[PDB]
Coordinates of C-alpha atoms in Angstrom, one line a residue:
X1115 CA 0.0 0.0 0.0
X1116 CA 1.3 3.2 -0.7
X1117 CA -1.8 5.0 1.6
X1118 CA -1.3 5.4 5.4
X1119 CA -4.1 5.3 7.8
X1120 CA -4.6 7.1 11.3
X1121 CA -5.5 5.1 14.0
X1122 CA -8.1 6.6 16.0
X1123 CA -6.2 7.3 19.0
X1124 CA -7.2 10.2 21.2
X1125 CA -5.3 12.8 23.1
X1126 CA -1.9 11.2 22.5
X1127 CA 0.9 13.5 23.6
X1128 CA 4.3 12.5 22.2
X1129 CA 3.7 8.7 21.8
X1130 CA 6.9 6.7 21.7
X1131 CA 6.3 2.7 21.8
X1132 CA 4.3 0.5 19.4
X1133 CA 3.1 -3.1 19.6
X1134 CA 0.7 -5.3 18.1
X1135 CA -0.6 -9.1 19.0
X1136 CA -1.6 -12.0 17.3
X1137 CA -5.1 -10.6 16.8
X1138 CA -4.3 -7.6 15.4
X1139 CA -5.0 -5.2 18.9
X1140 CA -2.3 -2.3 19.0
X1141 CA -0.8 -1.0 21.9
X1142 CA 0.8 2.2 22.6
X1143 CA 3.1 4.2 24.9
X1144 CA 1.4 7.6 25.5
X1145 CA 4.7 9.2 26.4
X1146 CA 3.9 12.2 27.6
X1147 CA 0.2 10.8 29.4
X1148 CA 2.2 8.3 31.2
X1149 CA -0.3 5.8 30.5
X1150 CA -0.4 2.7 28.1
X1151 CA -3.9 3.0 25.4
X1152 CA -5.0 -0.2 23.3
X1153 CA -7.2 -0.3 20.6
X1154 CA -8.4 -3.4 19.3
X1155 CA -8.9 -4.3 15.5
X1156 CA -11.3 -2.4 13.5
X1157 CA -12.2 -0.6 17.0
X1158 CA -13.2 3.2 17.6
X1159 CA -13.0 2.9 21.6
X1160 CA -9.0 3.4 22.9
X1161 CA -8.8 1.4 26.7
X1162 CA -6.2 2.8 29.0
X1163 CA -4.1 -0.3 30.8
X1164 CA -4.3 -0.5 34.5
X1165 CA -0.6 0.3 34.9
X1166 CA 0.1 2.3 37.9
X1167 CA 2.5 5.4 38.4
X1168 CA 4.1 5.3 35.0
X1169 CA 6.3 7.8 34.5
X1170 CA 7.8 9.1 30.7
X1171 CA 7.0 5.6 29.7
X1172 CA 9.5 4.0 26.5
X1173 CA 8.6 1.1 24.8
X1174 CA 5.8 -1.7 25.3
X1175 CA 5.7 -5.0 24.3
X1176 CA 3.4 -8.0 24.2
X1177 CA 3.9 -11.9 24.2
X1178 CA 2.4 -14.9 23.0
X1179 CA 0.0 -14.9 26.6
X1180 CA -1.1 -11.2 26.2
X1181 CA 1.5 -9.9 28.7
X1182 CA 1.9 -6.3 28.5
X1183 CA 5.4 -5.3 28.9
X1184 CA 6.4 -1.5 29.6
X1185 CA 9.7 0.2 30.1
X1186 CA 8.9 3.3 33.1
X1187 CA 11.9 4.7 31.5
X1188 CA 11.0 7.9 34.2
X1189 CA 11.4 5.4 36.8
X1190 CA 14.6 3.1 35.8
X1191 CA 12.1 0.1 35.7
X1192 CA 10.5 -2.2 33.3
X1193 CA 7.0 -3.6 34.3
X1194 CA 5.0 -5.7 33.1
X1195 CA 0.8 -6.5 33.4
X1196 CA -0.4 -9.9 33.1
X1197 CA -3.8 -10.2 31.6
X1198 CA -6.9 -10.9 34.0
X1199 CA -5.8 -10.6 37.3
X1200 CA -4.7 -6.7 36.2
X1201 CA -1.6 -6.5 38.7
X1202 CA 1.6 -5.1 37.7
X1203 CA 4.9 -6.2 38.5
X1204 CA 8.2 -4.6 38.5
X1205 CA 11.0 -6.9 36.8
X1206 CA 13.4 -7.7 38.8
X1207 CA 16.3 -5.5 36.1
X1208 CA 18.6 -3.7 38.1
X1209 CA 21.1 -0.9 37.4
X1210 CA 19.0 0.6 34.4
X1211 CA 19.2 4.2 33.3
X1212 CA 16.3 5.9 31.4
X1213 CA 15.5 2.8 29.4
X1214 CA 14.4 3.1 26.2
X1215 CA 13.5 -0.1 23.7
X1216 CA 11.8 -3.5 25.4
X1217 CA 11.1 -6.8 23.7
X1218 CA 10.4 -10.2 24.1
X1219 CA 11.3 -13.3 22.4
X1220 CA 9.1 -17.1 22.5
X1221 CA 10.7 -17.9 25.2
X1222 CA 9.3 -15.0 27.3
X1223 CA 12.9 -13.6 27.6
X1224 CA 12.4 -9.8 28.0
X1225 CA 15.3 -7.5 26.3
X1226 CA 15.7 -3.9 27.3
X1227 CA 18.0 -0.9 25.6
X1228 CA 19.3 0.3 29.1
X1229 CA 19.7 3.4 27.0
X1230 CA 21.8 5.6 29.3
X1231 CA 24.5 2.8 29.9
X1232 CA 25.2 2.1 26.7
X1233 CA 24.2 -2.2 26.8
X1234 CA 21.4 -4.3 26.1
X1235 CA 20.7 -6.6 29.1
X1236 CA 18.2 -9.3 29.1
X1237 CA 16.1 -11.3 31.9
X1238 CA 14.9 -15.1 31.2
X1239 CA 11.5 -15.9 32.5
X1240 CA 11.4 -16.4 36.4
X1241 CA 14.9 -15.5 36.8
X1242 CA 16.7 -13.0 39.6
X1243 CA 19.6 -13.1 36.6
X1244 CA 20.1 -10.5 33.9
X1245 CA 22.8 -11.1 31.4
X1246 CA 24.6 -8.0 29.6
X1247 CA 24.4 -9.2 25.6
X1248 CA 28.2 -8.4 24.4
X1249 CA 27.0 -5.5 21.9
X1250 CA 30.0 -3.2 21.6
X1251 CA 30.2 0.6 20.9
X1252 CA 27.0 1.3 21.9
X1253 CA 26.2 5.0 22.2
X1254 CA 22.7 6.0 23.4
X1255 CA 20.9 3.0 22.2
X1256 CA 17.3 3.1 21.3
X1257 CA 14.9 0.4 20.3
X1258 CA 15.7 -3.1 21.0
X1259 CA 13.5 -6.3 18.5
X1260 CA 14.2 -10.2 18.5
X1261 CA 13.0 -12.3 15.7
X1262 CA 11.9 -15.9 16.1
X1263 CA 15.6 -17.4 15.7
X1264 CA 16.4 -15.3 18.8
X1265 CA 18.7 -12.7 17.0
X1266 CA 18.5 -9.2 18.4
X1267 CA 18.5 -6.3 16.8
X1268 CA 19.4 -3.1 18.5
X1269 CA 19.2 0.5 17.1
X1270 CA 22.3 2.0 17.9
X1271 CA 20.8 5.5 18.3
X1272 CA 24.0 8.0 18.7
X1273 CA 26.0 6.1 16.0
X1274 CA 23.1 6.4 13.4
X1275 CA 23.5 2.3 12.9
X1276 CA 21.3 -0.3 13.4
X1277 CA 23.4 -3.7 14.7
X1278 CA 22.5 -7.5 15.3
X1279 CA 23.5 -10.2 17.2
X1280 CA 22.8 -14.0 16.2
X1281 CA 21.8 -16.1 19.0
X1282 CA 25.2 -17.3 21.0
X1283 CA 27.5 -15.2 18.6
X1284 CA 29.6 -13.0 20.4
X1285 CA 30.9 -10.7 17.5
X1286 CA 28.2 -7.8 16.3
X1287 CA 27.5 -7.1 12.7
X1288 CA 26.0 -3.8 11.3
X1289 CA 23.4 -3.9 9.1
X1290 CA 24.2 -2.4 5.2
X1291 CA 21.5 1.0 5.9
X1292 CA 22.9 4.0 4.5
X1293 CA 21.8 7.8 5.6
X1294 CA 20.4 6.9 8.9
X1295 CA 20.2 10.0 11.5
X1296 CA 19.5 9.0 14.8
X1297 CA 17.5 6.2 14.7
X1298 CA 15.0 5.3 17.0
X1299 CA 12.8 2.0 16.8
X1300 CA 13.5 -1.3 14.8
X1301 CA 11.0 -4.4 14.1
X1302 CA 11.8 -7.3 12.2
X1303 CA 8.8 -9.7 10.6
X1304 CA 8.5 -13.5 10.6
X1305 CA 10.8 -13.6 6.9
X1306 CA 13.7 -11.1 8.4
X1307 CA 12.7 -8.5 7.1
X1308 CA 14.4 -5.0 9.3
X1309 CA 12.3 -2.0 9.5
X1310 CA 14.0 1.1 11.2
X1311 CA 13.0 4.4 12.1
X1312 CA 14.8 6.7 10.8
X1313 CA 13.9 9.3 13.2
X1314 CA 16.0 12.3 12.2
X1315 CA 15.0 12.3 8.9
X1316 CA 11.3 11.7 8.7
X1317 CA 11.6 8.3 7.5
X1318 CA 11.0 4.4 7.5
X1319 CA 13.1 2.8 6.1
X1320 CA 13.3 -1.7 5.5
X1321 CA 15.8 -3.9 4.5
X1322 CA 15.2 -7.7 3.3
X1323 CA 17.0 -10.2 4.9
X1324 CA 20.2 -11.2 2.8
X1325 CA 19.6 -7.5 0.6
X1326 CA 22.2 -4.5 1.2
X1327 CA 19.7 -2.5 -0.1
X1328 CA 17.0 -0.1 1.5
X1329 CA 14.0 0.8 0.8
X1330 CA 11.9 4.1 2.0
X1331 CA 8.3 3.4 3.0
X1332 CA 5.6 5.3 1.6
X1333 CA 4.3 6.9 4.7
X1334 CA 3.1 10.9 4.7
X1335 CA 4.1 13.2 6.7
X1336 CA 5.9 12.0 9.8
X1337 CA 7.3 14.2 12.3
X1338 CA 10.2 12.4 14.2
X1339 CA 8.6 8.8 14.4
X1340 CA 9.9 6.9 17.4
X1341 CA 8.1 3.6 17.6
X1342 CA 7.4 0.8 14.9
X1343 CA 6.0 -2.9 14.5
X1344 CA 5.4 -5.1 12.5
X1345 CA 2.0 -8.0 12.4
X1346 CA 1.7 -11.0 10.7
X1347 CA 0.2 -10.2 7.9
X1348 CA 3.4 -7.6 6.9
X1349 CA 1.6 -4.0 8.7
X1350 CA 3.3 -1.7 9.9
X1351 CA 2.5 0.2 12.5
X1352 CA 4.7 3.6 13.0
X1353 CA 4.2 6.0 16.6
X1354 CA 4.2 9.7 14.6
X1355 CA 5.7 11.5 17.9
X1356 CA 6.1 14.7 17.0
X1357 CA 2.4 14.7 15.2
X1358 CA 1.0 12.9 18.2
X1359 CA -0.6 10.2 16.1
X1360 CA -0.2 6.4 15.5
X1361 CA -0.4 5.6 11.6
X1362 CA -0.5 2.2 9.7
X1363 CA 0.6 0.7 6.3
X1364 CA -0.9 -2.5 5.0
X1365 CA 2.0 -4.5 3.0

Protein backbone atom coordinates (compact mmCIF):
# COMPACT_ATOMS: atom_id res chain seq x y z
CA UNK A 1 0.00 0.00 0.00
CA UNK A 2 1.31 3.23 -0.67
CA UNK A 3 -1.83 5.04 1.57
CA UNK A 4 -1.29 5.36 5.45
CA UNK A 5 -4.09 5.25 7.75
CA UNK A 6 -4.59 7.07 11.30
CA UNK A 7 -5.53 5.08 14.02
CA UNK A 8 -8.14 6.60 15.99
CA UNK A 9 -6.17 7.27 19.00
CA UNK A 10 -7.18 10.18 21.18
CA UNK A 11 -5.26 12.84 23.06
CA UNK A 12 -1.93 11.25 22.48
CA UNK A 13 0.93 13.46 23.64
CA UNK A 14 4.31 12.49 22.17
CA UNK A 15 3.68 8.73 21.78
CA UNK A 16 6.92 6.73 21.70
CA UNK A 17 6.35 2.75 21.78
CA UNK A 18 4.29 0.50 19.42
CA UNK A 19 3.11 -3.12 19.61
CA UNK A 20 0.73 -5.34 18.09
CA UNK A 21 -0.57 -9.15 19.04
CA UNK A 22 -1.61 -11.95 17.25
CA UNK A 23 -5.11 -10.58 16.80
CA UNK A 24 -4.29 -7.61 15.40
CA UNK A 25 -5.01 -5.15 18.91
CA UNK A 26 -2.30 -2.28 19.04
CA UNK A 27 -0.85 -0.96 21.91
CA UNK A 28 0.83 2.18 22.60
CA UNK A 29 3.12 4.25 24.92
CA UNK A 30 1.43 7.61 25.45
CA UNK A 31 4.72 9.22 26.36
CA UNK A 32 3.95 12.18 27.57
CA UNK A 33 0.20 10.81 29.38
CA UNK A 34 2.15 8.33 31.21
CA UNK A 35 -0.29 5.78 30.52
CA UNK A 36 -0.41 2.70 28.10
CA UNK A 37 -3.92 2.98 25.42
CA UNK A 38 -4.98 -0.23 23.30
CA UNK A 39 -7.21 -0.25 20.62
CA UNK A 40 -8.35 -3.40 19.34
CA UNK A 41 -8.87 -4.31 15.51
CA UNK A 42 -11.29 -2.37 13.52
CA UNK A 43 -12.23 -0.59 17.00
CA UNK A 44 -13.22 3.24 17.56
CA UNK A 45 -12.96 2.95 21.60
CA UNK A 46 -9.05 3.40 22.91
CA UNK A 47 -8.83 1.38 26.68
CA UNK A 48 -6.22 2.77 29.05
CA UNK A 49 -4.15 -0.31 30.75
CA UNK A 50 -4.26 -0.49 34.46
CA UNK A 51 -0.59 0.34 34.93
CA UNK A 52 0.08 2.34 37.86
CA UNK A 53 2.54 5.36 38.43
CA UNK A 54 4.11 5.32 35.04
CA UNK A 55 6.34 7.80 34.49
CA UNK A 56 7.78 9.10 30.68
CA UNK A 57 7.04 5.61 29.67
CA UNK A 58 9.45 4.02 26.54
CA UNK A 59 8.60 1.12 24.84
CA UNK A 60 5.83 -1.65 25.26
CA UNK A 61 5.74 -5.01 24.28
CA UNK A 62 3.39 -8.04 24.25
CA UNK A 63 3.90 -11.85 24.22
CA UNK A 64 2.43 -14.92 22.99
CA UNK A 65 0.03 -14.94 26.55
CA UNK A 66 -1.12 -11.19 26.15
CA UNK A 67 1.50 -9.89 28.75
CA UNK A 68 1.95 -6.32 28.52
CA UNK A 69 5.43 -5.27 28.86
CA UNK A 70 6.44 -1.51 29.56
CA UNK A 71 9.71 0.18 30.15
CA UNK A 72 8.92 3.34 33.13
CA UNK A 73 11.88 4.70 31.47
CA UNK A 74 11.00 7.90 34.21
CA UNK A 75 11.45 5.43 36.82
CA UNK A 76 14.64 3.14 35.82
CA UNK A 77 12.12 0.06 35.73
CA UNK A 78 10.47 -2.22 33.30
CA UNK A 79 6.97 -3.59 34.31
CA UNK A 80 5.05 -5.70 33.05
CA UNK A 81 0.84 -6.46 33.36
CA UNK A 82 -0.39 -9.88 33.13
CA UNK A 83 -3.76 -10.20 31.65
CA UNK A 84 -6.92 -10.92 33.97
CA UNK A 85 -5.79 -10.60 37.30
CA UNK A 86 -4.70 -6.74 36.21
CA UNK A 87 -1.56 -6.54 38.67
CA UNK A 88 1.60 -5.09 37.65
CA UNK A 89 4.85 -6.22 38.51
CA UNK A 90 8.20 -4.59 38.52
CA UNK A 91 10.98 -6.90 36.80
CA UNK A 92 13.45 -7.74 38.76
CA UNK A 93 16.26 -5.52 36.14
CA UNK A 94 18.62 -3.68 38.11
CA UNK A 95 21.15 -0.91 37.35
CA UNK A 96 18.97 0.65 34.45
CA UNK A 97 19.19 4.18 33.33
CA UNK A 98 16.27 5.86 31.37
CA UNK A 99 15.51 2.76 29.41
CA UNK A 100 14.40 3.07 26.23
CA UNK A 101 13.48 -0.09 23.71
CA UNK A 102 11.77 -3.48 25.35
CA UNK A 103 11.11 -6.84 23.69
CA UNK A 104 10.39 -10.24 24.13
CA UNK A 105 11.28 -13.26 22.37
CA UNK A 106 9.15 -17.05 22.48
CA UNK A 107 10.66 -17.93 25.25
CA UNK A 108 9.26 -15.02 27.31
CA UNK A 109 12.94 -13.63 27.58
CA UNK A 110 12.45 -9.82 27.99
CA UNK A 111 15.33 -7.52 26.34
CA UNK A 112 15.65 -3.88 27.28
CA UNK A 113 17.95 -0.90 25.63
CA UNK A 114 19.25 0.32 29.05
CA UNK A 115 19.72 3.38 26.98
CA UNK A 116 21.79 5.56 29.33
CA UNK A 117 24.46 2.82 29.86
CA UNK A 118 25.16 2.06 26.69
CA UNK A 119 24.21 -2.22 26.79
CA UNK A 120 21.38 -4.28 26.13
CA UNK A 121 20.73 -6.56 29.10
CA UNK A 122 18.19 -9.34 29.09
CA UNK A 123 16.06 -11.33 31.85
CA UNK A 124 14.88 -15.12 31.18
CA UNK A 125 11.47 -15.87 32.51
CA UNK A 126 11.42 -16.43 36.43
CA UNK A 127 14.88 -15.55 36.81
CA UNK A 128 16.71 -12.95 39.55
CA UNK A 129 19.57 -13.07 36.64
CA UNK A 130 20.07 -10.55 33.90
CA UNK A 131 22.84 -11.11 31.41
CA UNK A 132 24.61 -8.04 29.64
CA UNK A 133 24.44 -9.19 25.59
CA UNK A 134 28.19 -8.43 24.41
CA UNK A 135 26.96 -5.51 21.86
CA UNK A 136 29.96 -3.19 21.55
CA UNK A 137 30.19 0.62 20.94
CA UNK A 138 26.95 1.34 21.89
CA UNK A 139 26.22 5.05 22.18
CA UNK A 140 22.65 6.04 23.38
CA UNK A 141 20.86 3.02 22.23
CA UNK A 142 17.29 3.07 21.35
CA UNK A 143 14.87 0.43 20.27
CA UNK A 144 15.70 -3.10 21.04
CA UNK A 145 13.50 -6.28 18.48
CA UNK A 146 14.21 -10.16 18.47
CA UNK A 147 12.99 -12.27 15.74
CA UNK A 148 11.87 -15.88 16.14
CA UNK A 149 15.55 -17.38 15.69
CA UNK A 150 16.43 -15.31 18.76
CA UNK A 151 18.72 -12.72 17.03
CA UNK A 152 18.52 -9.20 18.41
CA UNK A 153 18.54 -6.34 16.78
CA UNK A 154 19.43 -3.05 18.48
CA UNK A 155 19.22 0.54 17.12
CA UNK A 156 22.28 2.04 17.88
CA UNK A 157 20.85 5.47 18.25
CA UNK A 158 23.95 8.01 18.72
CA UNK A 159 26.02 6.09 15.96
CA UNK A 160 23.13 6.35 13.44
CA UNK A 161 23.49 2.28 12.88
CA UNK A 162 21.34 -0.29 13.39
CA UNK A 163 23.44 -3.72 14.66
CA UNK A 164 22.51 -7.53 15.31
CA UNK A 165 23.47 -10.21 17.16
CA UNK A 166 22.76 -13.96 16.21
CA UNK A 167 21.84 -16.07 18.98
CA UNK A 168 25.20 -17.30 21.00
CA UNK A 169 27.45 -15.21 18.65
CA UNK A 170 29.63 -13.05 20.45
CA UNK A 171 30.89 -10.66 17.49
CA UNK A 172 28.18 -7.78 16.30
CA UNK A 173 27.46 -7.07 12.67
CA UNK A 174 25.96 -3.83 11.28
CA UNK A 175 23.44 -3.86 9.08
CA UNK A 176 24.15 -2.37 5.25
CA UNK A 177 21.49 1.01 5.93
CA UNK A 178 22.92 4.03 4.54
CA UNK A 179 21.85 7.79 5.64
CA UNK A 180 20.39 6.92 8.94
CA UNK A 181 20.17 9.97 11.52
CA UNK A 182 19.50 9.02 14.77
CA UNK A 183 17.55 6.22 14.66
CA UNK A 184 15.02 5.30 17.04
CA UNK A 185 12.80 2.00 16.85
CA UNK A 186 13.49 -1.29 14.80
CA UNK A 187 11.01 -4.43 14.14
CA UNK A 188 11.78 -7.25 12.20
CA UNK A 189 8.84 -9.68 10.58
CA UNK A 190 8.49 -13.46 10.61
CA UNK A 191 10.76 -13.62 6.93
CA UNK A 192 13.66 -11.11 8.41
CA UNK A 193 12.73 -8.50 7.10
CA UNK A 194 14.43 -4.99 9.32
CA UNK A 195 12.34 -1.95 9.47
CA UNK A 196 13.98 1.11 11.15
CA UNK A 197 13.00 4.43 12.08
CA UNK A 198 14.76 6.66 10.75
CA UNK A 199 13.89 9.27 13.20
CA UNK A 200 16.02 12.34 12.21
CA UNK A 201 14.99 12.27 8.86
CA UNK A 202 11.27 11.72 8.75
CA UNK A 203 11.58 8.31 7.55
CA UNK A 204 10.98 4.37 7.54
CA UNK A 205 13.14 2.80 6.08
CA UNK A 206 13.26 -1.73 5.51
CA UNK A 207 15.76 -3.85 4.55
CA UNK A 208 15.20 -7.66 3.27
CA UNK A 209 17.02 -10.18 4.87
CA UNK A 210 20.25 -11.16 2.84
CA UNK A 211 19.61 -7.54 0.65
CA UNK A 212 22.19 -4.52 1.16
CA UNK A 213 19.72 -2.49 -0.06
CA UNK A 214 16.97 -0.06 1.55
CA UNK A 215 14.05 0.78 0.83
CA UNK A 216 11.91 4.06 1.95
CA UNK A 217 8.30 3.36 2.95
CA UNK A 218 5.62 5.27 1.62
CA UNK A 219 4.29 6.86 4.70
CA UNK A 220 3.09 10.94 4.69
CA UNK A 221 4.09 13.18 6.74
CA UNK A 222 5.88 12.03 9.79
CA UNK A 223 7.26 14.18 12.30
CA UNK A 224 10.24 12.37 14.18
CA UNK A 225 8.57 8.80 14.41
CA UNK A 226 9.92 6.92 17.36
CA UNK A 227 8.12 3.62 17.65
CA UNK A 228 7.40 0.78 14.95
CA UNK A 229 5.96 -2.85 14.48
CA UNK A 230 5.35 -5.09 12.50
CA UNK A 231 1.98 -8.04 12.37
CA UNK A 232 1.70 -10.95 10.67
CA UNK A 233 0.25 -10.20 7.92
CA UNK A 234 3.39 -7.62 6.94
CA UNK A 235 1.63 -4.05 8.67
CA UNK A 236 3.27 -1.71 9.94
CA UNK A 237 2.52 0.18 12.48
CA UNK A 238 4.68 3.56 13.01
CA UNK A 239 4.15 5.98 16.57
CA UNK A 240 4.15 9.69 14.63
CA UNK A 241 5.71 11.46 17.88
CA UNK A 242 6.10 14.66 16.98
CA UNK A 243 2.36 14.66 15.23
CA UNK A 244 1.04 12.92 18.24
CA UNK A 245 -0.64 10.22 16.09
CA UNK A 246 -0.15 6.41 15.52
CA UNK A 247 -0.41 5.65 11.57
CA UNK A 248 -0.48 2.23 9.73
CA UNK A 249 0.58 0.68 6.31
CA UNK A 250 -0.85 -2.47 4.96
CA UNK A 251 2.04 -4.52 2.98
Amino acid sequence: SNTQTVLPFTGLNTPSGVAVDSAGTVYVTDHGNNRVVKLAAGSNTQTVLPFTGLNTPSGVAVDSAGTVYVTDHGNNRVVKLAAGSNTQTVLPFTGLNTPSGVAVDSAGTVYVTDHGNNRVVKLAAGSNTQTVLPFTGLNTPSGVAVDSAGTVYVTDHGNNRVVKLAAGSNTQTVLPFTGLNTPSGVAVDSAGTVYVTDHGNNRVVKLAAGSNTQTVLPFTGLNTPSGVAVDSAGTVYVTDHGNNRVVKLAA
